[PDB]
Design a protein around this nucleic acid. Structure first.
Lengths: 250, 365, 1096
DNA sequence: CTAGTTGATCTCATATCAGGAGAAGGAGCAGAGCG
């Protein structure tokens, strides 16, 4: 087995299947769990980013870390295309977990709320889509989720979209975003992602814009004075430093 | 005592006994030393004092006039009478002097080379002690009531800042990141204090009568909200769980960091278990404060019994922390007392007050 | 930077903790004794204790407990160090090799925490599921064992009670359940908690909190049949098992508090309880069928003041004392007709709390000799320490009351003396001593009917035997006597003397000269002296012809070691000595240079002379005092030269080194007589008799400290030597109860003469203070002056002041009343000891306690409460102030070197004061502004000031190189682990500069000395190498152990070399040395470390 | 029953001079108590 600080043992066979960077990832995710903070797995796509979550959750359940005796009920929000992909992935890389799909396709064939309750009681891994999160913020946000992974989490990049608010209604600190590109147009998107994972780190949205987005943007324009270039440089470095612990971008 | 010297000498008692018992005896004998003075440099009231944690030689002092004075507390003259001369001073002419009242001033723990000072000009300035130039300035949108650096953090170098905003700002002195905020208070935060025991535990007290302990690493809000009654009056927490029946304008962890002392404008002091915020029901009687800003008070260290020195109007009221028995009230100031700071090496107390004086209390004989 | 070398001259002797168990093997019963830094492992044999291993911990052993985890064969040892190094030690013996492997270790020091008042407690669950440590107020550290660690990861449980007195794990509980007494404002209560290693928090205990006696200080966990706990308080012993509440108040335990306990049985039907008075109680649990019926306390007797006591087996109890000698007692079933069942089997020397000490060149040698105020209330005593020689006790035979020993070559061919002769009362018994075997077989020609004053081998291949009746010259080879002479009046010879060639025997007041001729005894000379002969010697020395030329005589009533010319018996010289005591032995020998004479009186005085071969006139009279018993002197020839031996209470070898007469001690209890023997089975050996047996052995170069003990039976406090008067002045203190009554006859109450202070200045149990004048030869209390009622003698100096010539005992006192915390009154009393009396020559009422007085350039420098003032001795013989100094919290310690005064403060730690004589006032030169609470201070150099803080640290301050020049610089830091009570210049021996001894509370005697920069660098390098090579018991780092440590500061050592670690460079094999000496050759460093060991 | 198709239907994302009269406030200031 592989052992980390307090009680985290991930099975050795599982660990050996991973790469070195994926192992680093698993360690990083567990350090966050210790802090009770969230993070963004900003690995460039194709780098087997999803496998890291499997390994980490597997290790956490296996270690039976101490409300919850190891891994509680958890929800995975991922784009509609990849739900069965994730189901497949859990099934191969760790059969023991129950991975219920929440979708019209699904596998339940009853009312959905019964399925939500079932997973929240039997401590499964409820996969769902951003739509069903937007549409059942009421039902879903009544069950003490342990982990709230968002795959391709950039879809929460609009702080005012409904889906964003719904995703930010979840209460647990163990929020994770798996986003190949956690910033696509401007930093307002970044702030939004951080406000899901770590609600206070970057401040309020107005303050973030005032302090970071404006200066960092103005330093990119061709006509910007060198002074403003250097303010942008400063602010950019501050931002990287602020977000360093909580973003793992290989 | 000669029993104490003989007991130390013969090994009957651990020398720890003589140290702590004598340290206590010295604290009980605190009296206004007219055989010691502090040089008058503040034109306005002293809001804050800070003796450096390593070597306890120097004291910072922040005035209502905006100046920061840096005193030397060692008697370098051969006389038995001396004035604690002022080494440096952020005076009226310093380009970086605060525009309004300096509300807090703090030595960087782990090193005397840097200190920080926050004011009503909405700035927390970091100073290089040697060159006495600002190394950094954090601007806040709202006047700063208090800040505090962790006395224990070898790892993080966050400054918790309480402003009139309802939010607690964490300023990372390592690469300057003043974005992080703790949310959950509703009115001005009048006092913040890091745990001396836990690296990332912060206690913040606010005018909404609530005190919250935070794990700033944690991304999920306050750990604990101190509740006067511990549950006798229990309500779905939206307005209940008040530490006090007024504003809570003072915080101080006891030395070992296992208890928290809060003073609020209901004229009470309470002692809280810092682990589960449970009220220990220590009485302390009535502690007059009506300060509209933070009230800086300290505890003793390295005595047989712990003491807390609280400004009580124009006096320093000394209490035994764990029993509440008021030792004495040190009467030597002329106006209300704003801050007292404890010199742990010699059981000396310095207290500033609105009458522009800093009085030394040293044990008698 | 300062370069200091610290080493241990005497390892700590105070037993701070002892446990018993099966540590070295499952069948061995071990006694593990913690002396402060030394762990001593014994095996509990049917008789006494057999040492097996003594290891040095890099720590003060604060906790020491044996526990056996499941499946383990033999007990593992848990040790917690004062700096909070935890370790679990196992004993692994591989044939000859012995190891202490560290099964686990760690550092459990919390970064912050109020160290608990009562002190570090360490308990172990009776089922070894966890080690509970109470280190700080309000916390309870748990070290799991079921989770088998190697790093001892421990977690705190928050304890809702902040003042915990004592705590124990209860027995017979499914969960680890602690029972502790804690003090809250409402009184003292006993509470229980269950420890959950899974939830890592307490739970409700089996039986709720109970309000107990006010002074409950002890919890005793009682094994499974009863369960529950027994809480000992001052006036009651109460038993709790949850519903049962037995409670007794035995009136016998009210007089003193019970401080240690031990479970005699495995089932807890009997406990030992030791009190601070030294009583030993037996607490009996009467079972009823099982529950507990009733409690009984019975007084077994008295022991040394026990810190810890352990019951070994068969009634043998080890009483480990910090204040007095540790004891091995026996508990008899029946009383001793004095009400006591305790009978001391063995005593282990403990230089107890060394509160003061002085180095006196007693016996007028070139050797220092420590005299220490050791011990406490009932165990107080003076210990005299000196470096002494030792030998091996090979051949023993127990014949009572020997009075003779002579080497005889019964085999005529060999020049080895293969036969030993002994006279007892009126006969001669011989020994074949064949080989190493010893049995009594008879050689012809010697009589079994008469005492023998002398016998031995003589010339012409003849033996000689001088009896109480007449002389017998035997021919060795052929047969018995062919020559006999006897006194014509047949008077018994009263004093004899003989050599290889001639004979000289005294008959009362007349003397007879005989000389040997082959098969003949010829008489020549005769004389009639004034008075009876006392002693003779006729030894031929540098003879070179065949006959000695000279003789010496001691006579009665005209006490004089006179000289005679041999052929004429005439007076060459007549030198008186004085006193009413007849000299009992006289000898002349050569020490490398010429004939000396050694004449002694019955009280150990001994005069050495330069004797001429022509005039034989006695001059160069000088005296040395050796022992109190009458003496006898017999030589043995070593490899090098003649080495004379003195036989008395203190056997002493006598010899000259570099043409300087040395008076070495021998580390044997007593020797009646001595004789050389060089058998085939015994080369160059000694033959040393005592009252019981004949001890035989050789001479060993290595020196072992010899510790005398003078029981004072009261706490000595100070000691100074007044050479002019031949005495020690000792401040003693005895505890009286009621007006008052002495609880026991102390040394003060048993003096020859006595007196009490009648002073005009000032007009349960109390402390009475006396000034003891103690004879520096016999160590008898010549005089005991009691001080005023409620007067505490603190300081004591012997000196002569001003210009008058009298040497005074000056005592500084304080008046101690319970109504106050610091004395307001005190006085400086000047005594003069002369004509066996202690007159009060002066007095001076001062307004505080006189904590310290040093004689300072003809003037008295006293330190009253916070003032240091200088007194002058006026022509009127009174003390008159000259200057004061006030900038002190408490001037506790004063030292002096020239015009400079070093003041150790209660908590401002040192101050360098200068008496500028041109002005007549003090000047604060430098000061150390760190808050160090001093225990003692010393001046090493003109600018190096050794200090000892009460946190077991040594620091050296240095006057630096403006107003920053008034800052002493701490250039030396070192954690000793011992509480220094005293420094003193001197050395116990005949590269390094200076030598400062210090005595500690634990009984360590250490030695600080100054190194040069080059040697310091070299030794620091080797220190690092040894740290890289030598492995400590608990895997503690030496640098961490020697790091300066205080509750508000911690810095690495510097400017100090652990001489213990360096001297450990000899006790490692050559490959390990090469590992040490990678980057000069090893033999160089072996020479270096030998030369370093030469200093102590 | 089950995929497949097909509307709605929602969400989210993309970008730079000949007026006059009267009423209300404020300012300046004399002066009167008055502490």
């Amino acid at each position: 087995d592989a052992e980390f600080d307090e009680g985290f043992k991930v099975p050795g066979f599982l660990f050996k299947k991973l790469f070195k960077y994926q192992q680093t990832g698993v360690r990083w995710l567990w350090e966050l769990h210790c802090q009770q903070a969230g993070g963004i797995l900003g690995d460039e796509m194709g780098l087997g980013r999803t496998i890291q979550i499997i390994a980490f959750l597997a290790g956490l359940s296996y270690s039976k870390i101490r409300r919850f005796e190891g891994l509680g009920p958890t929800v995975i929000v991922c784009p509609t295309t990849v739900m069965h992909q994730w189901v497949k992935e859990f099934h191969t890389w760790w059969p023991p977990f129950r991975v219920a799909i929440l979708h019209e396709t699904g596998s339940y064939t009853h009312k959905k709320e019964k399925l939500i309750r079932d997973v929240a009681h039997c401590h499964g891994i409820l996969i769902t889509s951003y739509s069903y999160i937007r549409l059942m913020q009421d039902d879903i946000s009544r069950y003490d989720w342990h982990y709230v992974i968002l795959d391709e989490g950039h879809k929460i990049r609009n702080p005012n979209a409904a889906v964003t608010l719904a995703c930010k209604q979840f209460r647990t600190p163990h929020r994770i975003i798996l986003s190949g590109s956690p910033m696509q147009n401007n930093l307002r998107e970044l702030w939004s992602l951080f406000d899901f994972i770590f609600p206070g780190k970057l401040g309020t949205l107005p303050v973030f814009m005032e302090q970071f987005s404006v200066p960092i943007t103005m330093g990119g324009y061709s006509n910007a004075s060198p002074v403003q270039v250097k303010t942008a440089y400063k602010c950019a470095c501050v931002l990287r430093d602020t977000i360093n612990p909580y973003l793992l971008r290989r | 005592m000669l029993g104490f010297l003989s007991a130390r000498q013969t090994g009957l008692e651990d020398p720890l006994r003589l140290r702590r018992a004598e340290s206590t005896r010295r604290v009980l004998g605190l009296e206004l030393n007219k055989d010691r003075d502090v040089e008058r440099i503040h034109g306005g009231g002293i809001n804050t004092l800070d003796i450096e944690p390593v070597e306890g030689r120097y004291m910072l002092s922040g005035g209502s006039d905006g100046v920061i004075v840096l005193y030397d507390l060692e008697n370098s003259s051969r006389q038995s009478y001396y004035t604690c001369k002022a080494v440096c001073s952020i005076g009226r002419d310093h380009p970086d002097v605060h525009r309004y009242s300096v509300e807090t001033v703090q030595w960087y723990p782990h090193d005397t080379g840097m200190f920080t000072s926050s004011s009503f000009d909405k700035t927390l300035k970091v100073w290089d002690t040697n060159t006495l130039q600002t190394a950094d300035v954090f601007n806040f949108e709202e006047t700063v009531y208090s800040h505090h650096m962790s006395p224990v953090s070898t790892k993080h170098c966050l400054v918790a800042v309480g402003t009139r905003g309802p939010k607690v700002q964490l300023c990372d002195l390592k690469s300057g990141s003043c974005s992080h905020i703790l949310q959950g208070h509703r009115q001005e935060i009048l006092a913040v204090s890091w745990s001396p025991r836990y690296d990332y535990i912060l206690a913040t007290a606010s005018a909404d009568s609530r005190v919250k302990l935070w794990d700033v690493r944690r991304a999920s809000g306050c750990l604990i909200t101190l509740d006067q009654h511990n549950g006798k009056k229990s309500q779905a927490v939206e307005s209940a769980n008040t530490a006090h029946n007024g504003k809570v304008n003072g915080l101080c962890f006891t030395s070992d960091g296992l208890h928290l002392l809060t003073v609020g404008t209901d004229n009470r002091m309470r002692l809280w278990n810092s682990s589960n915020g449970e009220n220990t029901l220590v009485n302390y009687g009535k502690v007059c404060n009506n300060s509209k800003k933070g009230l800086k008070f300290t505890v003793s260290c390295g005595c047989s019994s712990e003491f807390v020195f609280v400004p009580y109007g124009s006096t320093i009221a000394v209490y035994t922390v764990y029993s509440g028995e008021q030792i004495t009230m040190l009467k030597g100031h002329y106006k209300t007392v704003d801050c007292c700071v404890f010199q742990s090496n010699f059981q000396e107390l310095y207290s500033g007050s609105r009458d522009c004086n800093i009085l030394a209390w040293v044990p008698s004989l | 930077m300062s370069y200091n070398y610290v080493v241990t001259a005497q390892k700590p002797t105070a037993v701070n903790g002892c446990v018993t168990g099966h540590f070295t093997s499952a069948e061995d019963l071990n006694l593990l004794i913690a002396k402060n830094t030394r762990l001593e492992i014994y095996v509990v044999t049917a008789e006494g204790l057999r040492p097996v291993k003594e290891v040095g911990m890099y720590g003060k052993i604060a906790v020491m407990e044996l526990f056996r985890p499941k499946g383990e064969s033999k007990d593992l040892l848990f040790i917690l160090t004062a700096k909070y190094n935890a370790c679990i030690l196992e004993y692994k013996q591989s044939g000859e090799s012995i190891d202490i492997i560290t099964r686990a270790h760690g550092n459990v020091q919390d970064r912050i925490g109020r160290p608990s008042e009562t002190g570090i407690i360490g308990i172990i669950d009776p089922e070894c599921r966890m080690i509970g440590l109470r280190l700080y107020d309000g916390l309870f550290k748990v070290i799991p064992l079921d989770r088998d660690n190697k790093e001892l990861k421990a977690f705190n449980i928050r304890l809702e009670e902040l003042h915990v007195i004592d705590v124990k794990f209860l027995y017979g509980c499914q969960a680890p359940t602690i029972c502790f007494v804690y003090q809250d404002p409402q009184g003292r209560h006993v509470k229980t908690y269950e420890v959950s290693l899974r939830e890592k928090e307490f739970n409700k205990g089996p039986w709720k909190q109970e309000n107990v006696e006010a002074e409950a200080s002890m919890v005793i966990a009682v094994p499974e049949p009863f369960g529950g706990a027994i809480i000992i308080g001052q006036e009651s012993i109460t038993y709790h098992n949850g519903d049962k509440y037995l409670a007794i108040a035995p009136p016998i335990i009210k007089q003193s508090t019970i401080v240690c306990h031990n479970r005699v049985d495995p089932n807890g039907s009997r406990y030992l309880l030791g009190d601070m008075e030294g009583r030993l109680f037996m607490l009996l649990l009467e079972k009823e069928e099982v529950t507990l019926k009733d409690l009984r306390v019975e007084l077994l007797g008295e022991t040394s003041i026990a810190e810890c006591l352990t019951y070994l087996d068969n009634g043998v109890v080890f009483v480990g004392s910090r204040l007095g000698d540790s004891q091995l007692v026996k508990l008899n079933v029946d009383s001793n007709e004095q009400g006591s069942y305790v009978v001391a089997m063995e005593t282990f020397t403990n230089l107890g709390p060394i509160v003061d000490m002085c180095v006196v060149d007693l016996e007028r040698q070139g050797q220092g000799q420590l005299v220490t105020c050791s011990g406490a209330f009932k165990e107080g005593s003076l210990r005299i320490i000196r470096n002494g020689i030792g030998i091996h006790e090979h051949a023993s035979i127990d014949l009572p009351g020997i009075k003779g020993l002579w080497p005889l070559r019964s085999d005529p061919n060999r020049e080895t003396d293969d036969t030993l002769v002994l006279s007892f009362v009126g006969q001669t018994r011989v020994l074949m001593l064949n080989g190493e075997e010893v049995e009594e077989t008879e050689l012809m020609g010697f009589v079994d009917d008469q005492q023998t004053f002398f016998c031995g081998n003589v010339a012409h291949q003849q033996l000689i035997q001088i009896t109480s009746a007449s002389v017998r010259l035997v021919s060795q080879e052929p047969k018995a006597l062919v020559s006999e002479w006897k006194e014509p009046q047949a008077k018994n010879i009263s004093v004899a003397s003989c050599n290889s060639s001639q004979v000289v025997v005294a008959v009362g007041r007349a003397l007879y000269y005989l000389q040997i001729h082959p098969q003949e005894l010829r008489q020549i000379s005769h004389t009639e002296m004034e008075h009876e002969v006392a002693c003779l010697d006729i030894t031929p020395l540098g003879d070179s012809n065949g006959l000695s030329p000279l003789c010496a005589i001691g006579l009665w009533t005209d006490i004089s070691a006179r000289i005679l010319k041999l052929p004429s018996f005439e007076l060459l010289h007549k030198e008186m000595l004085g006193g009413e005591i007849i000299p009992r032995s006289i000898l002349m020998t050569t020490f490398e240079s010429s004939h000396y004479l050694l004449c002694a009186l019955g009280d150990g005085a001994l005069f050495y002379f330069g004797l001429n071969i022509e005039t034989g006139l006695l001059s160069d009279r000088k005296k040395v005092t050796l022992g109190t018993q009458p003496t006898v002197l017999r030589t043995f020839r070593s490899l090098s030269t003649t080495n004379v031996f003195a036989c008395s209470d203190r056997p002493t070898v006598i010899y000259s080194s570099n043409h300087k007469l040395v008076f070495s001690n021998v580390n044997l209890k007593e020797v009646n007589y001595m004789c050389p023997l060089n058998s085939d089975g015994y080369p160059d050996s000694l033959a040393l008799a005592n009252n019981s047996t004949l001890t035989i052995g050789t001479i060993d170069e290595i020196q072992k400290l010899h510790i005398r003990t003078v029981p004072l039976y009261e706490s000595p406090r100070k000691i100074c030597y007044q050479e002019v008067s031949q005495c020690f002045g000792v401040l003693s203190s005895r505890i009286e109860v009621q007006g008052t009554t002495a609880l026991r006859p102390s040394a003060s109450t048993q003096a020859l003469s006595s007196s009490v202070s009648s002073s005009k200045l000032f007009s349960e149990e109390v402390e009475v203070h006396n000034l003891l004048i103690i004879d520096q030869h016999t160590f008898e209390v010549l005089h005991a002056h009691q001080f005023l009622q409620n007067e505490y003698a603190l300081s004591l100096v012997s000196c002569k002041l001003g210009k008058d010539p009298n040497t005074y005992f000056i005592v500084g006192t304080a008046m101690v009343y319970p109504e106050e915390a610091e004395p307001k009154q005190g006085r400086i009393v000047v005594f003069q000891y002369s004509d066996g009396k202690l007159q009060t020559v002066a007095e001076k009422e001062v307004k505080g306690a006189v904590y310290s007085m040093v004689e300072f350039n003809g003037k008295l420098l006293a330190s009253i409460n916070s003032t240091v003032r200088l007194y002058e001795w006026t022509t009127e013989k009174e003390l008159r102030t000259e200057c004061n100094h006030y900038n002190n919290i408490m001037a506790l310690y004063l030292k002096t070197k020239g015009d400079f005064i070093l003041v150790g403060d209660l908590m401002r730690s040192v101050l360098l004061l200068a008496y500028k004589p041109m002005e007549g006032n003090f000047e604060e030169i430098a000061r150390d502004f760190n808050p160090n609470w001093m225990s003692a201070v010393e001046i090493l150099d003109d600018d190096n000031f050794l200090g000892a803080e009460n946190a077991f640290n040594l620091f050296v301050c240095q006057k630096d190189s403006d107003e920053e020049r008034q800052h002493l610089q701490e250039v030396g830091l070192f954690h000793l682990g011992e509480f220094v009570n005293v420094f003193c210049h001197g050395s116990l021996v005949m590269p390094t500069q200076g030598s400062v001894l210090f005595g500690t509370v634990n009984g360590m005697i250490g030695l600080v000395t100054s190194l040069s920069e080059s040697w310091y660098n070299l030794l620091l390098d080797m220190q690092n190498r040894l740290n890289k090579v030598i492995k400590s018991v608990g895997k503690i780092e030496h640098s961490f152990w020697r790091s300066f440590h205080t509750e508000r500061k911690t810095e690495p050592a510097t400017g100090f070399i652990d001489g213990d670690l360096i001297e450990s460079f000899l006790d490692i094999s050559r490959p390990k040395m090469q590992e040490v000496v990678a980057n000069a050759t090893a033999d160089d460093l072996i020479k270096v470390v030998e030369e370093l060991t030469r200093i102590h």
